[PDB]
Amino acid sequence: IGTTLVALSSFTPVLVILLGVVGLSALTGYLDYVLLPALAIFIGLTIYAIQRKRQADASS
Numbered sequence: 001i002g003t004t005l006v007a008l009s010s011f012t013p014v015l016v017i018l019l020g021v022v023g024l025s026a027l028t029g030y031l032d033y034v035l036l037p038a039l040a041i042f043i044g045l046t047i048y049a050i051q052r053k054r055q056a057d058a059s060s
Helices: 002-008 011-028 040-055
Strands: none
Touching: 011 040
């Protein structure tokens, strides 16, 4: 399966930009309503930072 997911990584570069579009979308969030869903995106990326270092190729 990992082979299958390994080629899947090709969406990883396209996945990163994907959040970026959503980040800007925050501007369309309500003053109170942009803290819960808009800021939540940053958290997904926060943990993702440590992943790149952790992944370290591996089985691949």
